[PDB]
């Protein structure tokens, strides 16, 4: 997809005015620089490949990271799935109002030894389990209970030292597009909850160790990476100016439009 | 000449002697729902003359240092004739609008407005943890005003109405990406927009969800010499187009 | 028993790759697509619309709507300067936050010509002419009308047609320019001067204002996507 090349021009004196227009009509001008001056015939070989949608969004970015301790009670992590807990992916998705994409979820799991007290600590390789629960199903509440038996829930196992795990998830929604904004309540009496958090129901994500409590505590940490594929976008939007403050809504504090210079003529 | 239009709809007619062109949506005219995208299981009701007409909202006064107004369109017509009666008895419904903002002045005044029509405008509350209530977001056929100073955080449930952030967090200058027209009092007298139905679901409820918002922001403020008439009003006139409803129930 | 050999680059996680991956939900049936109006096929459909430029910062108008209005009075002498700013659409604080500049701050290189639309939002009887110059670099910023008329300019008269389009051409030694600030690939200066005065009849307010839009022409292109510096985060939300 190349761009338009500039044709030659000649000096004119006529009744045709390409420069003088009216911008009250909500119509930006289609003026080419070969209309207000004298140009030469140049050929453009540049391309708009990197400014397409799929080359703009299909890049991996972290969304959340949680820790959990091996030799403990309540050592297992959980996370409701939403893309509004970071500041560099959330700003990119709020350029469009409605989106539609697949994913390629990728986890990077690290580990770190805790200050144990016993001597001659030798640990084997650790094993981790990432369980995905669709919205509505039973949730586990302890590290060892029998709800971790994933009778139907898809879940991956992973030992340390290998390549990071990766799975792909298709477009799981009720409506035809992920609505990034929702101006309206959730109940017909117009009370209580207002805004985007009435559409967010995409399921949770449970993580835990598989090995037992051998001789020394281990505190792990898992980071999650999104990657949208086959993206379509509708209804573009001005980009966010003020900083984010909350996850569930768009509350902000007012700030100036730009930073300031000293006068109107100083370059 | 390219300065006269005559829009007729139902039993009403809007004529103008000095106006710009007609900005139509994102390049698409409002049409009915086809059978490829339909999801309801039953027959829709198309009144098509009792609703598709020009309703006129309430006037607002353009003072010398004003800030702006907004209307939250799909329930501004909640009490307006037979459009406000089919909205209560039905469960679903899709529409497309035809906004026509008009404001006239002499050849000695000056000023400039910006008439946008944004879809899915989430507003921000004054307090950080709270969210604005229903009464402060939309008025029944009456404009809510912006404020040239900022709203304090000590208020519980109030819309943050600083004009230079437009209530949504974006810069106010970047609002021109939406369909929009300028009412410049030098050359223009009215602005027209034709908006199609923009939503992710083919039919939506009308009482819980306001999928459009019409904002009017004065960029160059109204100024006149002493002696001229100081009272300049602004009137908005909305007309739905190709409306159909579904799912009959009791009144609510 | 096919003999293979793993090359370097195995078992790494490159954040910008393109591979296949096994699905977690087999035989899922997605929701069918719908013709929602206004589909963006490319990011350069966004940066060809107008956006009002805050040319009037001056540290008192940045927290107001006063920043977009350029003041124009009726003088007593000729050749005064209306405004002036260098043309760096990714680093200069004037063009930093418009819709054009907010896409260039995601990329690194850019190339093409830039339009500049003005609109005289004054009275109906006021008249005057303006000069809209553009000086490629190498010299300083022009100081007078006599020095600024040498570059690329256009003389604009206000009438029934209110608007005017100065189209800054693409004059550069390289095929691209940096978004961030650089001495080596500077682009020049944009100035504007009174050609004649602004005459008004009696009982008319004297000071008229001017808006100024910006957009890109149909040969604009970007390259080398990066992250943006206009956002900041310390903890999660």
């Amino acid at each position, epitope marked *: 997809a190349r761009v338009a090349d500039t044709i030659s021009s000649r000096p004119t004196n006529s009744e045709s005015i390409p420069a003088l227009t009216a911008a009250e009509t909500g119509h930006t001008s289609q003026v080419v620089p070969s209309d207000t001056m004298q140009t030469r015939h140049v050929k453009n070989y540049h391309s708009r490949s990197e400014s397409s949608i799929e080359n703009f969004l299909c890049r991996s970015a972290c969304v959340y990271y949680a820790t959990y301790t091996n030799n403990s009670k309540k050592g297992f992590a959980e996370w409701v799935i939403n893309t509004r807990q970071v500041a560099q992916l959330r700003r990119k998705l709020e350029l469009f109002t409605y989106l539609r994409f697949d994913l390629e979820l990728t986890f990077v799991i690290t580990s770190a030894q805790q200050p144990s007290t016993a001597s001659s600590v030798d640990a084997p390789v650790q094993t981790h389990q990432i369980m995905y629960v669709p919205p509505g199903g039973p949730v586990p509440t302890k590290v060892k209970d029998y709800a971790w038996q994933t009778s139907t829930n898809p879940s991956v196992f992973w030992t340390e030292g290998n390549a990071p795990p990766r799975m792909s998830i298709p477009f799981i929604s009720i409506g035809n597009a992920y609505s990034c904004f929702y101006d309206g309540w959730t109940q017909f009496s117009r009370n209580g909850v207002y805004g985007i958090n009435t559409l967010n129901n995409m399921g949770t994500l449970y993580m835990r160790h598989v090995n037992e409590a051998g001789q020394g505590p281990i505190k792990s940490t898992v980071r999650i990476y999104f990657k949208p594929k086959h993206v379509k976008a509708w209804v573009p939007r001005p980009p966010r100016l003020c900083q984010y403050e909350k996850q569930k809504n768009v509350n902000f504090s007012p700030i100036g439009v730009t930073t300031s210079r000293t006068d109107i003529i100083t370059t | 000449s390219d300065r006269v239009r005559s829009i007729t709809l139902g039993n009403s007619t809007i004529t103008t002697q000095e106006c710009a062109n007609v900005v139509v949506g994102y390049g698409v005219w409002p049409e009915y729902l086809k059978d490829n995208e339909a999801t309801a299981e039953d027959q829709p009701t198309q009144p098509d003359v009792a609703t598709c007409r020009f309703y006129t909202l309430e006037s607002v006064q353009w003072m010398k240092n004003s800030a702006g107004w907004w209307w939250k369109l799909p329930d501004a017509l909640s009490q307006m004739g037979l459009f406000g009666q089919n909205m209560q008895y039905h469960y679903l419904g899709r529409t497309g609008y035809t906004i026509h903002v008009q404001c006239n002045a002499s050849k000695f005044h000056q000023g400039c407005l910006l008439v946008v029509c944004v879809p899915e405008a989430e507003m921000g509350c004054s307090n950080l943890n709270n969210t604005p209530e229903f009464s402060e977001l939309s008025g029944g056929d009456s404009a809510r*005003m912006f404020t040239d100073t900022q709203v304090g955080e*000590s208020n519980a449930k109030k819309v943050q109405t600083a004009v230079w952030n437009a209530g949504m967090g974006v810069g106010v200058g970047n609002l021109t990406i939406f369909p929009h027209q300028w009412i410049n009092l030098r050359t223009n007298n009215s602005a027209t927009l034709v908006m199609p139905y923009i939503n992710s679901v083919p039919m939506d409820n009308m009482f819980r969800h306001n999928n459009l918002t019409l904002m009017i922001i004065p960029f160059v*403020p109204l100024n006149y010499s002493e002696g001229s008439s100081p009272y300049v009003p602004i009137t908005v006139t909305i007309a739905p187009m190709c409306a159909e409803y579904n799912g009959l129930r009791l009144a609510s | 028993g096919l003999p293979v050999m793993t090359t370097p680059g195995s078992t790494q996680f490159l954040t910008s790759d393109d591979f296949q991956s096994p699905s977690a939900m087999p035989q899922f049936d997605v929701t069918p697509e719908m013709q929602i109006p206004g589909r963006v096929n490319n990011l350069m459909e966004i940066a060809e619309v107008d956006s009002v430029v805050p040319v009037n910062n001056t540290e008192d108008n940045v*927290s107001s709507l*006063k920043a977009y209005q350029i003041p124009v009075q009726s003088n007593s002498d000729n050749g005064k300067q209306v405004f002036g700013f260098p043309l760096q659409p990714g680093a200069n604080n004037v063009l930093n936050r418009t819709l054009l500049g907010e896409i260039l701050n995601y990329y690194t290189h850019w190339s093409g010509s830039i339009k500049l639309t003005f609109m005289f939002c004054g009275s109906a009887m006021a008249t005057g002419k303006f000069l809209l110059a553009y000086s490629p670099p190498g010299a300083g910023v022009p100081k007078n009308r006599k020095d600024a008329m040498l570059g690329t300019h256009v003389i604009w008269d206000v009438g029934l047609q209110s608007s005017c389009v100065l189209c800054v051409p693409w004059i550069s030694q390289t095929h691209y320019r940096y978004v961030v600030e650089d001495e080596y690939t500077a682009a020049g200066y944009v100035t504007c001067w009174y050609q004649t005065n602004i005459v008004v009849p009696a009982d008319v307010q004297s000071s008229c204002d001017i808006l100024c839009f910006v957009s890109a022409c149909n040969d604009f292109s970007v390259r080398m996507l990066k992250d943006t510096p206009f956002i900041r985060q310390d903890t999660f939300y």
Partner: antibody, heavy 124, light 107 residues
């Protein structure tokens, strides 16, 4: 010229109510922000709240310590300003001013240019 | 947010160069800083607005400056009429706060 006088002060018992009034003359009352600033005996100033003009909808903006107990309002007929006091304590004894403000550029800086002569309110 | 003025009590002979400071805790904009003047037992009065602009009725000896979190007010020569108290006002968020006050003593 700008002239603001006020009256209504005096000794009022703790827990009581009180109504102050600030009268304005010499300018159009519906175009200027009107503030309420109090000051204790020989101490620093303290701002209580203001009331916007007709162009912004006559909303009020109180401080953090006086919300729920105080109330600013104006009358529609003539140029007169009110201040409703409720649930007074011992530390509400001060000198109460009534200041005006205006737009300096095209914008609104937050200075208070013309001040009232100062009425006294004490409690016991 | 809180303002700190320093020093609180200052003496001044006629003819000397005199300056007082007004230091904020957090950063304020330069357009929202003002300076007031209150004499002995009278109403206050606006003296400097937006940290560099002289108000109405003020002589041309007064001149303020500063940026960020440090600001100053400089008088060229001390007279017998400008012996009073000076406050500084800021606004970054609600509420508007005032300084402690700088008391100027004639000598």
């Amino acid at each position: 010229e700008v002239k603001l006088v006020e009256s209504g002060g005096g000794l009022v018992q703790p827990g009581g109510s009180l109504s102050l009034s600030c009268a304005a003359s010499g300018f159009t009352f519906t175009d200027y922000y009107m503030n309420w600033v109090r000051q204790p005996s020989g101490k620093a100033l303290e701002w209580l709240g203001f009331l916007r003009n007709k162009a912004n909808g006559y909303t009020t903006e109180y401080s953090a310590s006086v919300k729920g107990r105080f109330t600013i309002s104006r009358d529609n007929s003539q140029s007169i300003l009110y201040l409703q006091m409720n649930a007074l304590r011992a530390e509400d004894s001060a000198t109460y001013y009534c200041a005006r403000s205006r737009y300096y550029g095209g914008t609104y800086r937050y200075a208070l240019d013309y001040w009232g002569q100062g009425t006294s309110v004490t409690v016991s | 947010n809180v303002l700190t003025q320093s020093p609180p009590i200052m003496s001044a002979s006629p003819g000397e160069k005199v300056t007082m400071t007004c230091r904020a805790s957090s950063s304020v904009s330069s357009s929202y800083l003002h300076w007031y003047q209150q004499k002995s037992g009278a109403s206050p009065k606006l003296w400097i607005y937006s940290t560099s602009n002289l108000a109405s009725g003020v002589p041309a000896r007064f001149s303020g400056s500063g940026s960020g979190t440090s600001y100053s007010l400089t008088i060229s020569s001390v007279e017998a009429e400008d012996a009073a108290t000076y406050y500084c006002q800021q606004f970054s968020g609600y509420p508007l706060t005032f300084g402690a006050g700088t008391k100027l003593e004639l000598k």
